[PDB]
Design an enzyme around this catalytic site. Structure first.
Site, PDB file in Angstrom:
ATOM      1  N   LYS A   1      -7.027  -3.305   3.334  1.00 29.70           N
ATOM      2  CA  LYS A   1      -5.815  -2.560   3.635  1.00 29.70           C
ATOM      3  C   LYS A   1      -5.375  -2.828   5.065  1.00 29.70           C
ATOM      4  O   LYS A   1      -6.175  -2.765   5.996  1.00 29.70           O
ATOM      5  CB  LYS A   1      -5.939  -1.040   3.357  1.00 29.70           C
ATOM      6  CG  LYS A   1      -7.342  -0.449   3.382  1.00 29.70           C
ATOM      7  CD  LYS A   1      -7.345   1.068   3.117  1.00 29.70           C
ATOM      8  CE  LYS A   1      -8.598   1.464   2.341  1.00 29.70           C
ATOM      9  NZ  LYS A   1      -8.977   2.899   2.464  1.00 29.70           N
TER      10      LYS A   1
ATOM     11  N   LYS B   1       0.829  -1.191   0.000  1.00 30.60           N
ATOM     12  CA  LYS B   1       0.000   0.000   0.000  1.00 30.60           C
ATOM     13  C   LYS B   1       0.870   1.251   0.000  1.00 30.60           C
ATOM     14  O   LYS B   1       1.520   1.564   1.004  1.00 30.60           O
ATOM     15  CB  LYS B   1      -0.963   0.045   1.181  1.00 30.60           C
ATOM     16  CG  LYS B   1      -1.940   1.191   1.020  1.00 30.60           C
ATOM     17  CD  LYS B   1      -3.002   1.184   2.074  1.00 30.60           C
ATOM     18  CE  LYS B   1      -4.162   2.065   1.659  1.00 30.60           C
ATOM     19  NZ  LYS B   1      -3.748   3.479   1.498  1.00 30.60           N
TER      20      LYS B   1
END
Length: 551
Positions: A418, A252
């Site tokens: 995430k 990420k």
């Protein structure tokens, strides 16, 4: 004649103000939509009721601030701007003020009034095209001409439309449902069609002409943005990588999400909120033309880099804001692609692992264009190693994705998760404020913050922020908020919803003190988000999910 008068629309909207039931609103709106035969009045009505004149991804913007409205209202009514401003604080809405000024004016100087939705649309399209010397004054003259022809109720919703807040309690959810009800379609397939076209007006027209079958048949086309697939925040790394047994894992990035369309004669780039940022990114545009295979639509992350080391995402946002040649030098960029939605035809119905293959053969990696490194694994230790590496590299953590999942536009499910070291910030609408005291009296010092209810478009209060501001921040924010003051009770002011702040917090608590049912504990100002309109503020659903995830 045969063309819908804006006044017919205006009277319809006025009646909706009294109605608080979501189902009742849905049914009233469906009934109205069903009886429109002219497909461009239909299109316009669907947009207009949502407080929109153009889709956000459309390069056209009206570019009409409240100050232009004041001058036009001055022109038509004869009353001076200072009085019209006190009227906005009296009535709490510029729409209601416009209505009052025109009511007084036609009483004094009678003429027949009413204008067509078609004329409103045409006047708006001209206003949007105006740039350069004298453009502001012509805009005022065009608005002045419109207010001179409008009924009091037309002037009300014309004003509210330009200000993008209709105050009807009608959001995206009601509109999806009303279009589904009117034209005998599943609300889910209206939704789905919206996610790949991002124009509810276009969707309504297809629903009118071709019903359910015509909506299912709609496809992704290059240069028309599709709503990005969104990820949920995972509680932890090992909980995510056990719900999915085997998982596709990527970094990420600390950057800004984009969607790249090409082609291959031209490139368009859309941001996370689907602003057209193509002209702001000549550097990335050129790199796409040399590094990527034509006929694709890619999902990626743009990151700011400088002398080989990563920079924080708000640097990319500055590029997005914008002589753009100077910006390419100050803030260099690179792009990391992680998905593909179009490869000579839709390919979102694949199989992540299959899309990945398509992505790999579509980009030829260079210094400025990269593929996201991906691993596939069931090992918690392997994903922690990537996580550690991502953080050491100056990024945020890892994305964990189901290798068999398809790409679902606009949806935030558990197929992507995430996991990052840092907590979430929120973007919240500034709905109110407080004047400072003593010396700081000339500045706003405190700000009321609201999240969005996406079905009704209502703003639900969620907290209040006073920390994280420099004094130049307060100078700047006071100047941009002052014109929007619509209520002042001493120190307390209320604003026309317009600006969005990025806000950090320690905790979300459940609390009866606000309509939302939630309160931020230790909210802290990060920055003003110009890249975000009020309908891109975080939703009550987001707040709820983020709350539940604390426990």
């Amino acid at each position: 004649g045969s063309h819908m008068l804006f006044a017919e629309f205006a009277e319809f909207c006025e009646r909706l103000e009294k109605i608080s039931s979501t189902l009742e609103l849905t049914a009233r709106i469906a009934a109205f939509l069903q009886k429109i035969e002219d497909e461009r009045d239909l299109y316009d009505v669907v947009l207009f009721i949502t407080g929109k004149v153009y889709p956000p991804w459309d390069e056209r913007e009206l570019g009409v601030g409240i100050g232009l409205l004041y001058e036009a209202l001055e022109n038509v009514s004869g009353v001076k701007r200072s009085e019209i401003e006190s009227m906005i604080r009296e009535y709490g809405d510029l729409g209601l003020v416009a209505e009052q000024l025109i009511k007084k004016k036609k009483m004094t100087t009678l003429a027949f009034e009413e204008l067509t939705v078609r004329k409103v649309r045409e006047t708006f399209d001209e206003i949007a095209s105006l740039t350069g010397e004298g453009s502001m004054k012509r805009k005022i003259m065009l608005l002045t001409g419109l207010y001179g022809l409008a009924t009091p109720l037309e002037a009300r919703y014309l004003t509210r439309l330009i200000l993008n807040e209709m105050r009807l309690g009608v959001g995206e959810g009601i509109m999806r449902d009303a279009i589904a009800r009117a034209f005998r379609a599943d609300p889910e397939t209206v939704e789905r069609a919206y996610m790949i076209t991002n124009d509810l007006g276009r969707v309504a027209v297809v629903a009118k002409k071709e019903g359910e079958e015509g909506l299912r048949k709609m496809k992704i086309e290059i240069h028309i943005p599709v709503r990005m697939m969104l990820a949920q925040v995972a509680e932890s790394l090992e909980s995510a990588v056990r719900e999915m047994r085997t998982a596709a894992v990527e970094w990420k990035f600390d950057g800004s999400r984009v969607q790249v369309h090409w082609d291959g004669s031209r490139v368009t780039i859309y941001s996370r909120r689907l602003e057209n940022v193509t002209n702001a990114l000549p550097d990335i545009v050129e790199e796409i033309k040399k590094s990527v295979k034509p006929g694709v639509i890619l999902d990626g992350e743009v990151i700011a880099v400088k002398e080989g080391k990563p920079m924080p995402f708000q640097h990319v946002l500055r590029r997005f804001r914008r002589d753009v040649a100077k910006m390419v030098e100050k803030i260099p960029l690179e792009a990391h692609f992680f998905d593909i939605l179009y490869h000579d035809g839709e390919c979102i119905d694949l199989p992540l692992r299959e899309r990945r293959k398509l992505l790999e053969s579509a980009v030829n990696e260079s210094e400025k264009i990269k593929l996201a490194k991906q691993i596939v694994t069931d090992s918690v230790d392997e994903v922690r190693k990537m996580y550690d590496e991502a953080i050491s590299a100056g990024h945020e953590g890892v994305m964990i994705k189901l290798p068999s999942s398809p790409y679902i536009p606009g949806k935030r499910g558990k197929n992507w998760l995430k996991v990052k070291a840092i907590m979430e910030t929120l973007d919240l609408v500034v709905v109110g404020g407080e004047w400072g005291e003593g010396k700081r009296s000339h500045w706003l010092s405190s700000f009321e913050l609201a999240c969005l209810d996406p079905v009704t478009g209502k703003l639900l209060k969620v907290g209040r922020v006073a920390t994280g501001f420099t004094e130049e921040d307060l100078e700047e924010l006071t100047e941009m908020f002052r014109p929007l003051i619509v209520s002042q009770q001493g120190k307390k002011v209320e604003f026309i919803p317009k600006y969005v702040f990025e806000v950090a917090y320690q905790e979300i608590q459940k609390s009866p003190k606000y309509e939302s049912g939630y309160a931020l504990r230790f909210p802290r100002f990060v920055r003003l988000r110009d890249d975000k309109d009020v309908d891109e503020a975080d939703t009550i659903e987001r707040v709820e999910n983020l709350y539940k995830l604390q426990f």
